[PDB]
């Protein structure tokens, strides 16, 4: 309702860098909020694409940002009569970024890995990797839970069980309040998908440069399955955390599997041991239900609610015709040990090919009335197709069907305005939470400030 669309601040990255593909707020130890921006096609120092990360200090005028340095050199280690190899070219560093406490976690989902042994190999595959940085000290660490040293022949002899070679760990990411990093790895277990969890403290304390294969003893990975419903489900395409079992001591995971069960799609709510607590099935095949997931209490009752995006949902129209517009589903958490039922509300896009529900961001309480709010992106929405972000305010009944406010893209066609979104943080210290919108196609990020 009260985001100011006139006085925008633009931050920009290099041409072709996809600056704005991902973003987050980052608060230093002093309390000063900056903006972390991922740029997965940034050219490294040898003119090869590696991706990169930028840390933008808050300024009304915006502009250019300093690049948060990471090691972009390939590594080789001859140990145990094997040869371990990392490959950082086209790794997509900054395809996701997330901040927790004084730490930034930037992932490279397409970082490749091989292990050679005489004439045999593991196979050169995208295991992915996450880079961790503590800016105020310079500390660096890495985490790459899917790297292995098993040869190709052994997977074949075991019918490809526990095959983590194509994980793309870091494809999605989230951090719990206690400092547990949770990574989505949609290529896990031969494209079923997996989650990898480890405490940030233990990632830092167990990492040393050049080792490449090491143990994080506190880590916890989800499980493989022979159930064909899960095949090619991309479980981990998106991920979030919340409180859904009424026990504040435990933390629950929300996982999107957009192609689960022959492209029906699904979202699952899990406990921290990865036991399924509830499954929400997609409505329409190929709609990509589970592309985006968001967790926030929108009806003021203190219990987290779930929002799921299906950005290729096709709406029925006159004379038996279908129109790809996208859809968002709201699930309100009921009282007691009861299950999440059917959706309390369905928001459907209006522009053909707009991809409404491609991103969903909790805003906190944008208007300070007591109910939390959300923003939904339609990256190719609006009459011209340049992109649109729609603000929905929470209320006792859940969300309002009519958006309180529409943000039209200020960038040209192809910008993907809204493809990434973050809110719930007051960047300028005015008492109202603000919104940051990435437009990777235009290599820029727009900041909208909430006003009284």
């Amino acid at each position, epitope marked *: 309702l009260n985001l100011d669309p006139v006085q925008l601040t633009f931050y920009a990255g290099p041409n072709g860098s996809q600056f704005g593909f991902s973003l987050d707020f980052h608060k230093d130890s002093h309390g000063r909020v900056a903006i972390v921006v991922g740029a997965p096609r940034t050219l490294g120092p040898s003119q090869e694409e590696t991706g990169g990360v930028f840390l933008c200090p808050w300024r009304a005028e915006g502009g250019q940002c300093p690049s948060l340095l990471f090691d972009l050199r390939d590594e080789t*280690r*001859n*140990v*145990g*009569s094997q040869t371990l190899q990392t490959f950082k070219a086209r790794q997509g560093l900054g395809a996701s970024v997330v901040s927790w406490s004084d730490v930034i976690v930037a992932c490279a989902p397409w970082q490749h890995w091989n292990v050679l042994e005489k004439t045999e190999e593991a196979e050169k595959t995208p295991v992915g990797s996450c880079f961790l940085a503590q800016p105020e000290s310079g500390r660096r660490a890495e985490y790459s839970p899917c790297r292995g*040293n098993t040869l190709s022949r*052994i997977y074949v002899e075991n019918d490809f069980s526990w095959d983590k070679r194509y994980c793309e760990a870091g494809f999605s990411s989230v951090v719990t309040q206690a400092g547990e990093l949770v990574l989505g790895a949609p290529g896990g277990y031969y494209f079923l998908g997996l989650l990898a969890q480890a405490p940030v403290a233990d990632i830092f304390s*167990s*990492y*040393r440069p*050049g*080792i490449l*294969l*090491w*143990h994080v*003893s506190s880590q916890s990975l989800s499980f493989d399955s022979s159930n064909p419903e899960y095949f090619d489900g991309y479980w981990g395409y998106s991920v979030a955390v919340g409180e859904f079992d009424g026990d504040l001591n435990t933390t629950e995971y929300v996982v999107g599997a957009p192609t689960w069960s022959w492209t029906l799609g699904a979202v699952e709510i899990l406990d921290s041991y990865y036991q399924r607590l509830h499954r929400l099935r997609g409505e329409q095949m190929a709609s990509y239900f589970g592309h985006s997931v968001a967790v926030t209490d929108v009806n003021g009752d203190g219990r987290h609610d779930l929002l799921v995006g299906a950005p290729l949902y096709m709406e029925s129209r006159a004379d038996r015709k279908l129109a790809e517009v996208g859809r968002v589903y709201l699930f309100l958490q009921p009282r007691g040990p009861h299950a999440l039922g059917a959706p309390s509300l369905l928001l459907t896009g209006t522009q053909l090919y707009g991809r409404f529900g491609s991103a969903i961001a909790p805003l906190g309480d944008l208007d300070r009335d007591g109910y939390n709010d959300i923003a939904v992106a339609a990256p190719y929405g609006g009459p011209s197709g340049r992109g649109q972000v729609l603000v929905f305010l929470g209320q006792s009944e859940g969300l309002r069907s009519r958006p309180s406010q529409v943000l039209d893209s200020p960038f040209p066609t192809g910008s993907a305005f809204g493809f990434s979104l973050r809110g719930a943080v007051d960047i300028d210290d005015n008492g109202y939470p603000d919104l940051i919108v990435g437009a990777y196609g235009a290599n820029q990020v727009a900041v909208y400030r909430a006003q009284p």
Partner: antibody, heavy 119, light 108 residues
């Protein structure tokens, strides 16, 4: 606290077999490679082999192939070393070992198990 | 197999000394070396992994160095607890192999 707890001193006859054990305390045995190492006063330290208890796969030094068999049981969090065809050269102290962080390192050791072969 | 030659096999030293134990590999092992300590009558404790990294809890007076085929363990300012046996181990190649050991003994 990571601790490898090995079984007690063994007094065994030549030509017989013995099976030594190493039980994980404060961690799970499948977390890492587990190695077995031999120590004798004059000949020093010799690596016997290793097991990945997650899947049972083993490697051996050729000198011990066909004498030493390493196994593991994740149910009881225990790794085992079996020595067949005991001879006077097998009188030694035997250690189980695992790495701290580096997959390939040899950082944590059990207290050792003394085997004495005699008639 | 990689032969690990450790030197010296013993040294007579005093409290507060700084001393080095060397290990020479029969080929390059690119820092895939560990250093181990055995106190009299006791088992083993790991000191260093991958050339220079201290095992958790190991005092900072222990340090590792070297490259290629030649490595060193240095103990700065010897403590009474440091009179013990020390061994290198390589894990560049299977089979892993150990040096012959160095005994630190008390000078008098």
């Amino acid at each position: 606290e990571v601790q490898l707890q090995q079984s007690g001193a063994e007094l065994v006859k030549p030509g017989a077999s013995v099976k030594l054990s190493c039980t994980a305390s404060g961690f799970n045995i499948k977390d890492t490679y587990v190695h077995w190492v031999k120590q004798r006063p004059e000949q020093g330290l010799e690596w016997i082999g290793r097991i990945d208890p997650a899947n049972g796969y083993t490697k051996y030094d050729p000198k011990f192939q066909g004498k030493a068999t390493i196994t593991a049981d994740t149910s009881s969090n225990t790794a085992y070393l079996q020595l067949s065809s005991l001879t006077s050269e097998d009188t030694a102290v035997y250690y189980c070992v695992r790495p701290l962080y580096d997959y390939y390192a040899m950082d944590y050791w059990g207290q050792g198990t003394s085997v004495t072969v005699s008639s | 197999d990689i032969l690990m030659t450790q030197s010296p096999s013993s040294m007579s030293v005093s409290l507060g000394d700084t001393v080095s134990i060397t290990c020479h590999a029969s080929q390059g092992i690119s820092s895939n070396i560990g250093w181990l300590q055995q106190k009299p009558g006791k088992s083993f404790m790991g000191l260093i992994y991958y050339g220079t990294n201290l095992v958790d809890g190991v005092p900072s007076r222990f340090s590792g160095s070297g490259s290629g085929a030649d490595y060193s363990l240095t103990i700065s300012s010897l403590d009474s607890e440091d009179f013990a046996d020390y061994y290198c181990v390589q894990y560049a190649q299977l089979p892993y192999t150990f040096g012959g050991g160095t005994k630190l003994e008390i000078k008098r």
